[model samples]
Target chain A: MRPLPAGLTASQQWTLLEWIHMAGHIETENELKAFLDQVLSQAPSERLLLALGRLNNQNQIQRLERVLNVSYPSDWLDQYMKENYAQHDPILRIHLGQGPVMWEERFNRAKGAEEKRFIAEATQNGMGSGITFSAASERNNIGSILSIAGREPGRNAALVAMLNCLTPHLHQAAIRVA
Target chain B: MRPLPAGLTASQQWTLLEWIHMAGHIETENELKAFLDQVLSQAPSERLLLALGRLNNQNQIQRLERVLNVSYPSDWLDQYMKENYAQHDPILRIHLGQGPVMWEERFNRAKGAEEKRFIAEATQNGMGSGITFSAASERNNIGSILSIAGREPGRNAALVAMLNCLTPHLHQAAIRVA
Candidate 1:
């Protein structure tokens, strides 16, 4: 896969501006849901799975509050929540930290039985490749992650940068709406 | 003057990270006040003038809520609030919108008498050169500016970038404390 985006392309920059303008108007849960839908559909991978949620101190997904199941089976996330997989999932380390994590390769390194089950189940559910964008506010004792599930980024730098940059806006919007 | 930095240097990047970590822990007004002090002092242009406050829908400064007076005479900002200069000041348009505006040059373009008075008064009060970083959330009906006073950036791309990137974080912090 191509290296994670170094910088945003012109189109991606404009896209970010548009998203910011859109984000400014979000005041309700419905609007945030609509925002999640629009941002995901317009991403480099138009049909990728996307979710935004709160993170606990351990950097684990505390809640998968809002999700758009465009690619993965609709039941995948529900099962993920039910299984409490976020606790032992190795990828939690990647999602909460400030970095671009490639999920597939990281999953290959999964060693724990539950972590393996987490990967195996996701793969069986048609998950292929993906990356995550995360942000945390220490002053507020708050943290969040925008998890994008889809194919590798061999040709998707612009998409990656677009969502990556918008994480703060999304984080703010998440706080206001929720 | 050095041209505005196109990208962050390594030192700048680390500094930004530290600020983000610091920003996360803010909860109350005193904490926020301390944050303002720390960030301003650590900035590339240490002792720069800074004030963060609410902005009206016009993207004009509506209030001079919190200020750290290091360079400008203590009375400069007080008079700014008293005289209601923001309504007629041309630079408000620059700070509320996204863009780097050099105070001296922009002030030189001042056309109206009030705008001229605004510039002349600042100059008399030790305002030499400065730049502003602003962010607004239309959804929240909130906009703010971190108005930094003094010295154009021939060498402060990092400082400029650091505060510019932190505008959103500051905006959130302002909301929380207030």
Candidate 2:
């Protein structure tokens, strides 16, 4: 097995392993919801929002759509789509890279006016200092993103690590169910 | 991501990462069946059998019913059940421990006449020197084992690692469809 990220306490390691184990066991959407809620209960680091959807990159331009198998709050997603943030949200393609990408980092990196506006507006709308980690599919056709958002970033290095492991299972679970 | 086992060279690693990526993307039983067969094309070390059912250990005794979401040879399983091998097959409980349990290892470890006879019979029935690994659920009730059999050990350390990752996805796919 590969080494877990650095700076984990023994207790943290144990809990992360337990969560990873549970992640693989999930097989449905409702189970994923409950699993996320249960993880929130213990970790309390972020308000979990699972975004299970599809990204069609069949054309040269990327097209993102929601399956809504499970997702972020309707209003959050509603505003996101209404504003057409999918065109500019780097978070949408963060899966193209690796590890947890903090919203703060992305927001800070934002140079485009539209993307910056979306990031700031997102923060005001209950996504302050959030983090996103994803399970990207082959062919850029499907994706699952678990956005750990809330008022504070809330002590998240370990949470980031846990979610990185956990989101793929959530993605797998989401697709398996109707 | 954690380091995959070192025995994997670049091609195997890329192939494995690709397989691992799909492991999360698979959503249904058909997808899993095709996926397993696809892996069979590349790995070719062994035939894949995913037996997903339940292991009821309500009392001290462990009872396992198998699920062949991806079927092995029907005659193989038929004979296995006819012989009442669930009671004697070491592969059934290898899920209870660290795995890629080779038939040779179990055969060598066999101290009991009954289990040895069962193991020898399994070898003759196309399992030869094969490997078995698994994914288990929270209650110990839902269990899935991917027995990679039907060949000699076949240079399987990498194949073993591949299936250890693959079986959980197969289990998830089974749960969704069943």
Candidate 3:
């Protein structure tokens, strides 16, 4: 058996379960936003975003809607698209269990001014460390992604667990309500 | 967001995400069993049981099948059925997020010889304390339950979190294969 992560005990694990169970029961977007607000407030994070999108006839993915704890900058989507951070973002990679990479680490390693500016603006906008999980529906081709960002310097395991536990439910909830 | 469970830090929570991501990729029962074996081995438990059942047209639940670490008593099913422990099992209650209920507490409160005998046999069979989660499919009325039992007292929060994280995946996998 692999060792439990540092400072985490069996009793403390139930809180994760409790939160997941609570999150799974949400049936509407309002409930989901409320839930995300509650979760983001508890964690040392500045914002949370749960976005759902779909593949178009041309095979490109299009953004549907995003629910966030705080209003994003008006140019947030345009900037995000122009910078294309999602292409190499560690948050999605870690969520998919590919590898561990932090936004701060990437920001520090960045060489190009555009990349650096994108990372800097994200951090200034309250995204420090974050993770995202994206899954596509096999039947309908609809896809959903849940992304949570924090203003802290390093990854938070508890928040990751909470997000990990909620991902599948969020996927199902999005599909069901869509 | 509600406060994270006490004593849990962000760094320690990634293990949960790692395990969940690992479990989500499983496509077969053998893989699922192997995954559960590894998880349960790390916990304070001696055994784990993952059972999935469906409700039939008769409105009665039937045991679809069960996966276990060790061979169960030959009469375990018959005994369980005759006794109807599912009606009051604490594992199911906690999984449903009704409240926290430990097997030990339930055993002590058991008032009848039948209940006592079932609890005693389960203890002797290596089930000390455990948690369970149950979900029903709205489309087909299919139901699935995941139960983990241990020989130690108090709740195993790590196991609970792992199981909770795995529950939705397990449900989806079961439906896909069924």
Which DockQ values do the candidates obtain, in the order shown? 0.08, 0.18, 0.06
Stretches off by above 4 angstroms in model 2 are A1-170, A173-178, B1-3, B56-66, B69-71, B95-97, B150-154
- List the global CA lDDT of all models: 0.63, 0.63, 0.54
Better of 1 and 3 by lDDT: 1
Q: Which portions of model 1 miss their true places by more than 4 Å?
A: A1-8, A20-26, A44-58, A62-73, A87-89, A93-95, A152-155, B1-64, B68-72, B78-173, B176-178
Q: Pick by TM-score: which candidate is best?
A: 1
Predicted model with the maximum DockQ: 2
TM-score, chain B, predicted structure 2 = 0.79
How far in Å is the alpha carbon of B136 misplaced in model 3?
A: 9.2
lDDT of model 3 at position B80 = 63
In candidate 3 the C-alpha lDDT for residue A147 amounts to 61
lDDT of 2 by residue, B22-47 (tens): 55556566777788888877765546
Global CA lDDT computed for model 3: 0.54
* Tens-digit per-residue lDDT, A39-118, candidate 3: 66666656556666665543234545543334345476566668786654434333222222455665677676656666
Question: Ten residues in a row with the worst lDDT in model 3 chain B?
Answer: B91-100
Q: What TM-score results for chain B in every one of the models?
A: 0.79, 0.79, 0.64
Q: Which 10-residue window in model 2 chain A sums to the lowest lDDT?
A: A58-67
